[PDB]
Amino acid sequence: PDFLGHAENPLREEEWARLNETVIQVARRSLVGRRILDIYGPLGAGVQTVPYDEFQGVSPGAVDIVGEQETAMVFTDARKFKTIPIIYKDFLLHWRDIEAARTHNMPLDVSAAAGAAALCAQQEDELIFYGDARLGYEGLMTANGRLTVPLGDWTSPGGGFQAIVEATRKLNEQGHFGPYAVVLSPRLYSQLHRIYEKTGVLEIETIRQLASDGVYQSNRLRGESGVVVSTGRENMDLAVSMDMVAAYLGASRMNHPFRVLEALLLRIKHPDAICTL
Amino acid sequence: PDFLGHAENPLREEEWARLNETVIQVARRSLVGRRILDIYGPLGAGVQTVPYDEFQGVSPGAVDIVGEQETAMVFTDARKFKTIPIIYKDFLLHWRDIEAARTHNMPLDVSAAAGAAALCAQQEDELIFYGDARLGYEGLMTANGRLTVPLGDWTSPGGGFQAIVEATRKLNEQGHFGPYAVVLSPRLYSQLHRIYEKTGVLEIETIRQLASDGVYQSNRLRGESGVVVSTGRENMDLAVSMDMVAAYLGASRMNHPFRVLEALLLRIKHPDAICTL
Amino acid sequence: PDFLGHAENPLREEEWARLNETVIQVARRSLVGRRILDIYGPLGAGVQTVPYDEFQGVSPGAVDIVGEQETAMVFTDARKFKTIPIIYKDFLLHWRDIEAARTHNMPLDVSAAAGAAALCAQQEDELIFYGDARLGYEGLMTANGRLTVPLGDWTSPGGGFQAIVEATRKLNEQGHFGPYAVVLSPRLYSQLHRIYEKTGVLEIETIRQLASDGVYQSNRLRGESGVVVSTGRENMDLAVSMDMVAAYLGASRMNHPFRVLEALLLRIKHPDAICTL
Amino acid sequence: PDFLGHAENPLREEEWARLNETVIQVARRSLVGRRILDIYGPLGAGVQTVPYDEFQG
Amino acid sequence: EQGHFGPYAVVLSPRLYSQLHRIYEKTGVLEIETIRQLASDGVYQSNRLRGESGVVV
Numbered sequence: 010p011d012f013l014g015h016a017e018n019p020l021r022e023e024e025w026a027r028l029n030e031t032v033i034q035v036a037r038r039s040l041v042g043r044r045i046l047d048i049y050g051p052l053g054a055g056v057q058t059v060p061y062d063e064f065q066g067v068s069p070g071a072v073d074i075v076g077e078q079e080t081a082m083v084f085t086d087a088r089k090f091k092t093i094p095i096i097y098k099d100f101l102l103h104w105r106d107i108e109a110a111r112t113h114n115m116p117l118d119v120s121a122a123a124g125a126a127a128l129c130a131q132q133e134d135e136l137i138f139y140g141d142a143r144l145g146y147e148g149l150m151t152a153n154g155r156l157t158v159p160l161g162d163w164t165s166p167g168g169g170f171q172a173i174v175e176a177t178r179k180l181n182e183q184g185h186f187g188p189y190a191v192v193l194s195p196r197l198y199s200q201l202h203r204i205y206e207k208t209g210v211l212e213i214e215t216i217r218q219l220a221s222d223g224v225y226q227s228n229r230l231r232g233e234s235g236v237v238v239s240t241g242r243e244n245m246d247l248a249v250s251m252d253m254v255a256a257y258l259g260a261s262r263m264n265h266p267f268r269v270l271e272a273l274l275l276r277i278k279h280p281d282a283i284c285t286l
Numbered sequence: 287p288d289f290l291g292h293a294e295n296p297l298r299e300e301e302w303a304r305l306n307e308t309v310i311q312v313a314r315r316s317l318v319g320r321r322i323l324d325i326y327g328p329l330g331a332g333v334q335t336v337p338y339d340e341f342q343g344v345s346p347g348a349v350d351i352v353g354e355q356e357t358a359m360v361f362t363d364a365r366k367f368k369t370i371p372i373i374y375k376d377f378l379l380h381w382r383d384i385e386a387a388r389t390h391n392m393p394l395d396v397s398a399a400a401g402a403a404a405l406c407a408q409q410e411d412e413l414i415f416y417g418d419a420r421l422g423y424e425g426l427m428t429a430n431g432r433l434t435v436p437l438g439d440w441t442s443p444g445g446g447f448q449a450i451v452e453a454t455r456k457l458n459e460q461g462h463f464g465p466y467a468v469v470l471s472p473r474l475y476s477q478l479h480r481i482y483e484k485t486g487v488l489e490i491e492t493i494r495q496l497a498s499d500g501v502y503q504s505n506r507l508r509g510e511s512g513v514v515v516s517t518g519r520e521n522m523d524l525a526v527s528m529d530m531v532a533a534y535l536g537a538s539r540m541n542h543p544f545r546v547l548e549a550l551l552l553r554i555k556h557p558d559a560i561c562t563l
Numbered sequence: 564p565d566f567l568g569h570a571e572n573p574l575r576e577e578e579w580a581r582l583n584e585t586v587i588q589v590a591r592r593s594l595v596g597r598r599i600l601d602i603y604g605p606l607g608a609g610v611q612t613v614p615y616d617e618f619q620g621v622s623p624g625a626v627d628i629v630g631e632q633e634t635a636m637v638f639t640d641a642r643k644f645k646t647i648p649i650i651y652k653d654f655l656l657h658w659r660d661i662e663a664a665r666t667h668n669m670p671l672d673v674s675a676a677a678g679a680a681a682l683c684a685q686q687e688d689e690l691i692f693y694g695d696a697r698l699g700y701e702g703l704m705t706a707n708g709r710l711t712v713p714l715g716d717w718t719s720p721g722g723g724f725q726a727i728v729e730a731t732r733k734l735n736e737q738g739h740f741g742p743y744a745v746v747l748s749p750r751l752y753s754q755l756h757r758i759y760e761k762t763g764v765l766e767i768e769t770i771r772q773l774a775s776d777g778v779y780q781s782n783r784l785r786g787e788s789g790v791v792v793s794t795g796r797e798n799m800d801l802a803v804s805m806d807m808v809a810a811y812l813g814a815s816r817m818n819h820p821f822r823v824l825e826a827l828l829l830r831i832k833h834p835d836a837i838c839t840l
Numbered sequence: 841p842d843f844l845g846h847a848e849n850p851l852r853e854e855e856w857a858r859l860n861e862t863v864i865q866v867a868r869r870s871l872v873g874r875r876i877l878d879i880y881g882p883l884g885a886g887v888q889t890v891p892y893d894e895f896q897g
Numbered sequence: 898e899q900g901h902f903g904p905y906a907v908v909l910s911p912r913l914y915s916q917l918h919r920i921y922e923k924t925g926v927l928e929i930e931t932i933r934q935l936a937s938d939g940v941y942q943s944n945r946l947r948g949e950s951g952v953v954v
Contacts, residue, residue, distance in 0.1 A: 011810075035520065094350055095351065101360075111609075115329075121340070195455075199454060205487060207445070207483070209485060228458060260814075263824075293846030331843070365646050369642045
């Protein structure tokens, strides 16, 4: 077992069960992008592909008995699924370590495992909020349908407010409404949280009651925030192939390399819910 | 049993079970440093040693299929574990006492037991927040990686705010983010809680919504506070060998000496999350 | 067929048994530092750590019966155990040959293995006799408590007699005495191989009868230096975690790489027993 | 429960046997004054007193 | 210096060996015992080596 190899999953079932638990704990807490959108069902590793395009658009029904049509409801003119990514951040455990834990010490050191997961899940959000274009994907800086609201006009004192109202109005128009979520760069959040004159009241209290879903801060959004959405289903979906898991590079040098595998793809099924600054 | 000795654990199982319960109750409520950092697993008394150094540093992944490397993820250049401390505050119970309780009175007097635990757990925090250098340890006044923010500029009225924003900014930069916790000396806390002009609003309300984890007060931090951290795992870990327990000096003079044994060591796995005034 | 691969154990149980036998044989012949100090017990690779310090240290007291008064001895002082190194010398076995040995030839050759182990164990001794600034060690040149004698090993016929005699003087005087062992540079040994001396017999007879545990030659010691110690245990211990073994790197581009793994750490628990030139 | 010490004889019979053996090893090696005079026989802790003493002829 | 050390063997032309066998070394006793201890694997004589040369390995 020191010798070595192969396929021991060099841990044991107990340490192995822990390794999974530690990774999913730290990852789920450091993911800010799974809280703004309710997740899709796990698709398994069998699928390479996530369903793609909808909406456009909006006509309603009265009615009584017969006499109601558009609809179809189409299902929108376009295919096929652009393959769900594989993103990973790897880690190794050292020579003795684990096997030192199988002789004397009952605790297994997860120090690198969770640390990688926190870093990996982080960039996962970078994949979502930014554009990508490497693999030629969407997210929202690129979704269009924004009618390019300038938002902003957030300088100094006086508030600090008007942007989100401009957003709700524009969001409301065109026929898409729901409970709204707002994402900001930390730098704006503080700049609006401040310079109570001081007369004074707070920025957080006014936005959080207006948004009515919540307000979130991501480190990965572009310095000039930001994006407002509508949490409603069949608008955006976070399509998850595999969750956070522990995987093995499997052998390197008298060591063990691990990776954390996350396949998440976010698809825009309704790009009218998106507005940037 | 009056006579005496030895190894009676001179209490009985019922009184003994209580003694444990009383100690852990008062200790857990008076410990402010286990609430700012999620605990490690108990390592048992078998181990003398706590794992030591990580991070430095931060590079992300895209990706698709093959083609993603740094990583390793190293596991950082340095060993070995600097032995987890034994800290204790002792107490005695008197001559008759306990045995008076085994004849007539059903309640056992825990007055000294819990009192010692409250005092012992207190200094335990002193071990954590200050430097030590007796046993040559870390904690945060000594962690470095602060880029020495001056923080402060907290005098008078007007707020009262800017320090924590300077902190979040600097914290945010360099590539480490999370939910943040803020620790202060009681003296600052009141000085900022006050001198609403009065126009007026509160200090507590603005910081507590910004920190987004919580704000805590310790009596043991240096008079000029303070330290801001990131609660995220694989950043700091409170490594617990043994919890709070009742132990016996075992015999002294027609009495019984007790001690409360606590072995807690806090390791800094990511000293970029630390900023002092 | 072969197949190809990555399931081995490139050998079979017999050849594998051979390689192990060959390596420890040649390594043991090339190890001069395990013959001057009796080994510690095997701790397995399970332990990462070997206990480090004693003495220094105080002599006095007795009166009659109670106290008057001491000590509490020592401990002495601080910890932890400086992790036992894992040293390696690597070699590859080349492609097909092994599988030619699976049918065609009965003898499997050693491209390196006996040679690498010979190279590795030797370098291990260089680790033992010299110090290492690299990771935290005690050599036999850095331990202090050396009271360096004005060398010895002259040209003139008395020569090394006076030297080892002077060594025993101060060694004994420091308040530490026992059976002695002497280690010399080969060049010193030949210049000290006498010629003639006292007219009864030669130098080997006088030194071997004086130190009286043995006389040894190492090539890894400094050419000018030579060292005297006391073989008695609980003074020095040669701490061996894992012995010398053949280990597997695994499948590579195409090759079978091996390494020889040796973990040896020497601790000086009473550094009054060391004397240099 | 456990955590040992009052204690008992906190070593065990094997470990205890070692400690005794080690002591006589290092002590007999470090005693130079029992080699120049043949020792008296052990009397046990029962005696407080060692036979004595004459001279001059 | 080349970074190669080990147990040494010395091979000489027979003509060298006797010239070296030799006398007392004035310190001194024989060449054989002093060399045999330096190379310390052995000292050997072959006739087929060149007369002036000799080699250590």
